[PDB]
């Protein structure tokens, strides 16, 4: 089966400054003849549904702040956010869709004020 | 009164007749498909984009770099892959580790010997413009051409038990220099060998000299190899030349059903059942006629380009007391009864539910390759292919035109079975607009009360 | 506007059964294949099943094989998720989930979530 | 020999897959055809009573 796997578990970002969620696989999700990094980036507050942020790995959707930007290639995928705030304090989960019949999700990392 | 007629236009074949006009036909077979290179029930082939299996296993430079390559319900190679073997030269035993890859989905690809580990021959060096990553000179990169280094190649004592529990592809290859001088330019000893041996293996290899003609710029060959590595099973290598030694395994993860398709097509994003060289089909009738070489569960092939069902009448049925087939009535398809009618409506949907039971049973075509000294097999295998495709779709069209036979006889007998039924109720060759529901509601409730309508008798014993 | 409110949750027995039931409002239901997401409570997002707009595609985590039968009616705008057989494993909140595009199964709107327990 | 043994097992199972469909159609004819002759001939009993 396809596993993803976060590098960090609870970053610690203050206020207003980088915060990046790593996020590898077990397989690269890459497929050479779309050039499409089937990825997926949400994002789930306390007692709140998952709220998805980055698809595609790189796309933006649509209501999503701009401080969100999603990157990386194959099995290393980042999700980057310009700056911290109050509102950004959730657990990110990474969900890859390569294997339709077995989506696996990542085990999420939470963001927390420093 | 009156069986039912449409100027529907579809015809049928039956045996005795090849063209018959039949108000509802469905049609059980498949021309069309997306043209599409198309997923297979959710997972995403491994679509080798202008690249070959031996050149993906051996790792091309000039193909797709693969890294950590996912499962695949299938392959796709070209007919003719632009990046073959780039160094030229065989693969030994190709066919057969394709009919082998045809029974897996995924590979794990594990690091059998470091390239650091070869600290007296130089790993680095083993490069080749005929196979250029990124401009730069370079080579195939799960196999490491040896070099010797100052000008000694000592013997290759290596050995690599499977110690993962799953099986494994362990790749290598024989250099083929042009010339002595060539063999002494690269490995100091003259005469050399790769002397390979597992479990269930034993080669000795010297490498076969010989002036040979330029391909790809370069007329040295490559011949390389494989050998499935069984778990707690070690292959020791054991070479002074000419070894083009292992990088990285294969491990087998999971062996299911997969198939190398020869389709040029690109990728569509799509998702189907069934998946064929020339497209997919989204159907569920139980033939088609696209390409043999299909792969999920799809429709099962047959080589003819028009296969349809009766399901419909074939417009005594013009003969005395049935006006004939009156275009006017619509509901039922006899005399406009439910008892007749909406049961053969009911069996159109077993009718084609019976041929998809029936011919269940048909030859799974499967995707063989054989190379250029086994023209006898593959001929063999091409007929037996043809053969077996040529005997099924003979019975699907006897199959159907015998059932389009009996389903149009079905449908001639219960009219006059209606009318038979029909003609013993009145007991009179009386034909018999104003007595609605008079003369006509006995008829179709099957109590006719003949003695009560005696005087019609009467009438036909005063006008006789 | 576009919203899926679940419904069908509470507390289950053991090897009990149970079938959920997400309402569709706001969108074409008929056109975004739609999926089921359980979280424990104390873990991360697990996918459950999942069905095509058709209903001609439909998939099922190796955990939930042979247990779950997602269907969908496309007249009624609702989708469900039949439960058989239930272990303790499945004390979760199942959310419900529409990916838009036909063949990628990123999840965009999702839905508030049923807690379902299964225990004594 | 995968390929050859991959080719004579479909091979094998290919023509015991047509042989098996000409028994299991033959006998369905047949019992077709059975049951019609016994259709027929009472028909043509009650013919000949007729
Ligand atoms: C049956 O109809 C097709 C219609 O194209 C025609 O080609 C064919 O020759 C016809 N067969 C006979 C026996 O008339
Ligand atoms: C290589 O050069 C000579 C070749 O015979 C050898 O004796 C010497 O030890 C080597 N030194 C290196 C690797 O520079
Ligand atoms: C390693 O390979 C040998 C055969 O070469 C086998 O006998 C042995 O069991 C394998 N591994 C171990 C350490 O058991």
């Known amino acids: 089966d396809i596993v993803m796997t976060q590098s960090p578990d609870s970053l610690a970002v203050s206020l207003g400054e980088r915060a990046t969620i790593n996020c590898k696989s077990s397989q690269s999700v890459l497929y050479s003849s779309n050039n499409k990094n089937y990825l997926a980036w949400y994002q789930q507050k306390p007692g709140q549904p998952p ?49 339709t019949p077995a989506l696996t999700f990542g085990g999420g990392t939470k963001v927390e004020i420093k | ?46 679509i080798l984009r202008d690249c070959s299996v031996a050149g993906w296993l051996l790792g091309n430079p000039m193909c797709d770099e693969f890294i950590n390559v ?81 000008s000694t190649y000592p013997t290759i004592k290596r050995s690599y038990n499977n110690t993962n529990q799953e099986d494994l592809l362990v790749l290598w290859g024989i250099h083929h220099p042009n010339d002595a001088a060539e063999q002494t330019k690269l490995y100091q000893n003259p005469t050399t060998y790769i002397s390979v041996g597992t479990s269930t293996l034993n080669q000795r290899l010297v490498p076969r000299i010989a002036t040979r003609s330029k391909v790809n710029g370069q007329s040295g060959r490559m011949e390389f190899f494989w050998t499935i590595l069984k778990p707690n099973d070690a292959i020791n290598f054991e070479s002074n030349g000419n070894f083009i030694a292992p990088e990285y395994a294969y491990k087998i993860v999971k062996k299911g059903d997969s198939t190398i398709m020869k389709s040029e097509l690109e990728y569509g994003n799509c998702n189907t059942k069934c998946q064929t060289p020339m497209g997919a089909i989204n159907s569920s009738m139980p033939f088609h006629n696209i390409h043999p070489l299909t792969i999920g569960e799809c429709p099962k092939y047959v080589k003819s380009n028009r296969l349809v069902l009766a399901t419909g009448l074939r417009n005594g049925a013009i003969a005395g007391f049935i006006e004939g087939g009156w275009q006017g009535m619509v509901d039922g398809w006899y005399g406009a009864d439910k008892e007749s009618t909406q049961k053969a409506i009911d069996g159109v949907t077993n009718k084609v539910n019976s041929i998809i039971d029936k011919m269940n049973t048909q030859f799974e075509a499967v995707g063989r ?75 179709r409730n099957g109590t006719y009360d003949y003695p009560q309508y005696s005087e019609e008798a009467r009438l036909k014993r005063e006008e006789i | 506007e576009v919203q899926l409110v679940e419904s069908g949750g509470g507390l289950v027995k053991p090897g009990g059964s149970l079938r959920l039931s997400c ?98």
């Open chain 2, 369 to 443: 390759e054989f190379n250029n000294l086994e023209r006898r097999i593959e001929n063999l295998n091409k007929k037996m292919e043809d053969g077996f495709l040529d005997v099924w779709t003979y019975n699907a069209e006897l199959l159907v035109l015998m059932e389009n036979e009996r389903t149009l006889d079905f449908h001639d007998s219960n009219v006059k079975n209606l009318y038979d039924k029909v003609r013993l109720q009145l007991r009179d060759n009386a034909k018999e607009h104003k007595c609605d529901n008079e003369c006509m509601e006995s008829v």
């Open chain 2, 70 to 150: 996912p499962e695949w319900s299938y392959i796709v190679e070209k007919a003719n892959p632009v990046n073959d073997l780039c160094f030229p030269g065989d693969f030994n035993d190709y066919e057969e580790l394709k009919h082998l890859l045809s029974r897996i989905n995924h590979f794990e690809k594990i690091q059998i010997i470091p390239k650091s580990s070869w600290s007296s021959h130089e790993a680095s060096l083993g490069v080749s413009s005929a196979c250029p990553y990124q401009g730069k000179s370079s080579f195939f990169r799960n196999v490491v051409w040896l070099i010797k280094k100052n």
């Open chain 3, 23 to 120: 309402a569709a409002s706001g969108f074409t239901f008929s056109s975004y294949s739609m999926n089921w997401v359980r979280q424990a409570p104390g873990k991360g997002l697990e996918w459950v099943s999942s069905i095509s707009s058709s209903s001609s595609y439909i998939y099922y985590a190796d955990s939930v094989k042979g247990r779950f039968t997602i269907s969908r009616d496309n007249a009624k705008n609702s989708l469900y998720l039949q439960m058989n057989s239930l272990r303790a494993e499945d004390t979760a909140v199942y959310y419900c989930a529409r990916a838009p595009a036909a063949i990628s199964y990123y999840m965009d709107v999702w839905g508030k979530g049923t807690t379902v327990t299964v225990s004594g």
């Open chain 1, 51 to 99: 709220k998805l942020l980055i698809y595609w790995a790189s796309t933006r959707e649509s209501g999503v702040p701009d401080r969100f930007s999603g990157s990386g290639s194959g099995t290393d995928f980042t999700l980057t956010i310009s700056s911290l705030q109050a509102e950004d304090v959730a657990v990110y989960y990474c969900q890859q869709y390569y294997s």
């Open chain 2, 1 to 46: 009164i009156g069986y039912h007629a449409n100027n529907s236009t579809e015809q049928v074949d039956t045996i005795m007749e090849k063209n018959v006009t039949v108000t509802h036909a469905q049609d059980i077979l498949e021309k069309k498909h997306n043209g599409k290179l198309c997923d297979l029930d959710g997972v995403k082939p491994l």
